[PDB]
Amino acid sequence: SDHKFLTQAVEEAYKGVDCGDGGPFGAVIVHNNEVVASCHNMVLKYTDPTAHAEVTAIREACKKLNKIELSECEIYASCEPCPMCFGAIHLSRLKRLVYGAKAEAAIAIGFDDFIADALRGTGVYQKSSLEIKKADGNGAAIAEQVFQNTKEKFRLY
Amino acid sequence: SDHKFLTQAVEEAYKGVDCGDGGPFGAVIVHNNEVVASCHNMVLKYTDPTAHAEVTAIREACKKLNKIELSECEIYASCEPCPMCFGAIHLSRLKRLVYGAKAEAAIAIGFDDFIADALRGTGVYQKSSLEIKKADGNGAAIAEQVFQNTKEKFRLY
Ligand SMILES: COc1nc(N)nc2c1ncn2[C@@H]1O[C@H](CO)[C@@H](O)[C@H]1O
Ligand SMILES: COc1nc(N)nc2c1ncn2[C@@H]1O[C@H](CO)[C@@H](O)[C@H]1O
Ligand SMILES: [Zn+2]
Ligand SMILES: [Zn+2]
């Protein structure tokens, strides 16, 4: 199940970078094995720098479920959430986060050196008790290769 | 300059709680003393936990200026931006942030202890070069009074 939804997030990343909707990032929000939202970066399509994959998925899931809290839901991110997106995940009350690639893979192709302290447990003020799973093995390898695979299909923002 | 726009953000907070749109928070994005966006919390209105005043203002200013970066603009927040909104401010490339009330003022009336390390200078993985101004004197008094005045006039989230 973890592999299935992380794979879906990776496919969302590829599909979005191929749509021109934005960067190669995907996010899937699940409610007891039922997919609530399946999204990718929409920064370019929406002219919205907050329209990240995780934020877009949170917005869609909350609108679909008619509630501002997703405490019975989990989020699968193709790449490690940035500070903004991790803050959005915290505010969403999502109960579990599974991400595929480390932020360094996105940074290696020119993305912002923009990493969430609360995710890595390196903050003074911002804490996290959110359940966080770093994927390993096959799905992790695929998610990390996402960025080397899609460097030509888009220009960074 | 700063006091007028900070007071407009505070007025946005009051209007938002009066409308039931969300919590007592406002944000005003300006470009050389010209307001590009004036917003408040829309979390309850939009059923969107990311619809913070700062995020909403960034969305609307990016729509108005037809671009995803606001490097020529400044943002006034009635209260200290949370980690999500500070990440959004970083991503939007806003060149200056002026905030009125410290996050403790919002915490003292029931909001989460949810503070951005990068804003306060305690970040390790997230570093901001943004010019940040904490308001003093009358602006600080107004912004802090927001939370005493709006106590139990809105639903918490
Ligand atoms: C769209 O969904 C996204 N998801 C993630 N996770 N990151 C994204 C992103 N869009 C841009 N980025 C940048 O990638 C690094 C984060 O690792 C930071 O530099 C981000 O600004
Ligand atoms: C919508 O506009 C907002 N702006 C800011 N800055 N904060 C907000 C907020 N809505 C709720 N909050 C909470 O207040 C604390 C941050 O000081 C945290 O707990 C936040 O979740
Ligand atoms: Zn993000
Ligand atoms: Zn915020």
Residue A136 lies inside a defined structural domain of this protein: yes
CA A86 to chain CA centroid, nearest Å: 9
CA distance B8 to B146: 12
CA distance B13 to B8: 9
Active site residue A60: no
Q: Which ligand is nearest to the CA of B114?
A: 2
Q: Give me the sheet containing B74-79, strands edge to edge.
A: B35-40, B26-30, B74-79, B96-101, B131-134
Strand runs (DSSP E) across chain B, as ranges? 26-30, 35-40, 74-79, 96-101, 131-134
Q: Which of B44, B122, B157 lies closest to A125 in CB terms?
A: B122
Q: Which residues pair with B101 in a beta bridge?
A: B79
Q: Which of B63, B68, B117 lies closest to A126 in CB terms?
A: B117
Q: Which ligand is nearest to the CA of B78?
A: 2
Q: B57 with B39: CB under 8 angstroms?
A: yes
Residue A123 lies inside a defined structural domain of this protein: yes
Q: B49 with A88: CB under 8 angstroms?
A: yes
Residue B116 lies inside a defined structural domain of this protein: yes
CA distance A129 to A96: 10
The residue annotated as part of the active site, out of B11, B12, B54, B74, is B54
A85 is known to lie in a ligand binding site? yes
Residue for token pair 């990440």: B87
* Shortest CA gap A4–chain B (Å): 27
E strand or H helix that includes residue A155: none
CA A32 to chain CA centroid, nearest Å: 19
What's this structure's resolution in Å? 2.2
Residue A157 lies inside a defined structural domain of this protein: no
Residue B155 lies inside a defined structural domain of this protein: no
Residue B156 lies inside a defined structural domain of this protein: no
Residue B125 lies inside a defined structural domain of this protein: yes
What technique solved it?
X-ray
SS3 B148: helix
> What is the CATH number for A51?
3.40.140.10
**How many domains is chain B partitioned into structurally?**
1
CA distance B47 to B97: 27
Residue for token pair 């390993």: A136
CA distance B57 to B76: 10
Residue B91 lies inside a defined structural domain of this protein: yes
CA-to-CA dists, residue B119 to A65, A145, B11, B82, B132, angstroms? 33, 33, 23, 9, 8
Domain enclosing residue A127, as ranges: 1-150
The rounded Å distance from CA B52 to ligand 1 centre is 19
Torsional sign, CA B34, B81, B93, B46: negative
CA distance A73 to A58: 10
Amino acid identity at B154:
F
Task: Report chain A's C-alpha Rg in angstroms.
Answer: 14
CA A134 to chain CA centroid, nearest Å: 12
Out of A10, A12, A25, A115, give the residue to mutate to test ligand 1, the one with the largest number of ligand atoms within 8 Å of its CB: A25
Closest listed residue to residue B153, CA positions, set B24, B12, B4:
B24
